[PDB]
Amino acid sequence: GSFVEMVDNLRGKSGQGYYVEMTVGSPPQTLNILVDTGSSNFAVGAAPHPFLHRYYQRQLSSTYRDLRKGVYVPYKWEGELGTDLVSIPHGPNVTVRANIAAITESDKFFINGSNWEGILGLAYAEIARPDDSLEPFFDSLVKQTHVPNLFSLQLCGAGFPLNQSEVLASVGGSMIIGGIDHSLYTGSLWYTPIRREWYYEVIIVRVEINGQDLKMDCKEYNYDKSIVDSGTTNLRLPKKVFEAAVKSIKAASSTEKFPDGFWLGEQLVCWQAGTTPWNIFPVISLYLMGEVTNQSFRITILPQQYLRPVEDVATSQDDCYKFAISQSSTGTVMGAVIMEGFYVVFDRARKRIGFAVSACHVHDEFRTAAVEGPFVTLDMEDCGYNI
Ligand SMILES: CC(C)C[C@@]1(C)NC(=N)N(Cc2ccc(CNC(=O)Nc3ccc(C#N)cc3)cc2)C1=O
């Protein structure tokens, strides 16, 4: 591990998000900021809100610059554009002038108890609001400093519920800015092409549930796109792929009957402490296009990743979980529960995303997450969706 100053700089969890400490303004104002690879705006609460115990006060920053332009982001939050000096305490020792959207109005944006006050959009300018002329934070970082155009994320799910006091004292992972820290993963890193620079878009070419091919036209897996998004909790799958996957997951776990509410990801299921039947649930393998023609690799997740720990509505001693796979109408989304199994490298300089087994993924004595390759795969370019 060559980036010790950034290791363990994250806190949070899949459901409420993973955040990193940042400072904005002069003198520096400390804020917790959601790490989001699925958006491209650096935006912070800048006005009183029931869920914020602190917010960006522009009038107290001598380096604040008003852009005299509003921004509307409906998913929704509204803000005022400006720039100011930004730093990451547990990151590269550099200060950069970046665009900041001061959130003045928000609806269902801030999460009660998440402990974060802003969002750091790490994706490309093509999806930045109001438009692509608003330079994303990481772009500014790279243009103004010597920091390598690359970042890596190790999101660490605890494998069990973290109460309000525990999630504040618990290390939730690492965001390494400008490099790859080898202590964060085991085995080898496998790279899949970033198909286009807007979201971190990738191409899935094969899906297996316990080794069984889901056998769908691979274009279905990427309809209308597949992205890596730390701002989403679940593994989200296109409607038809979701239906086929759930059918297969139910078949594999048929020794136990689960209510429809469970499969809809709306209700928790509980087992007596320590007795969760991990082995009746199948592993899920996603094959990704490789860097070499006709070559792919696979990332395999365990039910310890797709079953999200939730505290029993009775706070009992039972181990309870919600099914963290849901349907999407916007393509495949590899959210935080999937990222928790892997050390993910966003190699912007080489337009590639790397995957390796996470040194902090949750597992059991019989199965482990995996990243394996290579596999002969033909016509992978046809798995990509075109409008
Ligand atoms: C691919 C992308 C364009 C879609 C998506 C989901 N991925 C993102 N990273 N963001 C950005 C994002 C990140 C984090 C938040 C945090 N607040 C929320 O979640 N509130 C919320 C609450 C309940 C529901 C529901 N029912 C929906 C949203 C909001 C937006 C998105 O909007």
Swiss-Prot record:
Monomer. Interacts with RTN1; RTN2; RTN3 and RTN4; the interaction leads to inhibition of amyloid precursor protein processing. Interacts with SNX6. Interacts with PCSK9. Interacts with NAT8 and NAT8B. Interacts with BIN1. Interacts (via extracellular domain) with ADAM10 (via extracellular domain). Interacts with SORL1; this interaction may affect binding with APP and hence reduce APP cleavage. Interacts with NRDC AND NRG1. The modification N6-acetyllysine is found at residues 69, 215, 219, 225, 239-240, 247. Its EC number is 3.4.23.46. Its main location: membrane. It comes from Homo sapiens (Human). Expressed at high levels in the brain and pancreas. In the brain, expression is highest in the substantia nigra, locus coruleus and medulla oblongata. One of its GO terms (molecular function) is peptidase activity. GO terms for biological process: amyloid fibril formation; amyloid precursor protein catabolic process; amyloid-beta formation; amyloid-beta metabolic process; cellular response to amyloid-beta; cellular response to copper ion; cellular response to manganese ion; detection of mechanical stimulus involved in sensory perception of pain. This is Beta-secretase 1. N-Glycosylated. Addition of a bisecting N-acetylglucosamine by MGAT3 blocks lysosomal targeting, further degradation and is required for maintaining stability under stress conditions. Belongs to the peptidase A1 family. It catalyses: Broad endopeptidase specificity. Cleaves Glu-Val-Asn-Leu-|-Asp-Ala-Glu-Phe in the Swedish variant of Alzheimer's amyloid precursor protein. Responsible for the proteolytic processing of the amyloid precursor protein (APP). Cleaves at the N-terminus of the A-beta peptide sequence, between residues 671 and 672 of APP, leads to the generation and extracellular release of beta-cleaved soluble APP, and a corresponding cell-associated C-terminal fragment which is later released by gamma-secretase. Cleaves CHL1. It comes from the Eukaryota. Induction: Up-regulated by the Ca(2+)-regulated transcription factor NFATC4.
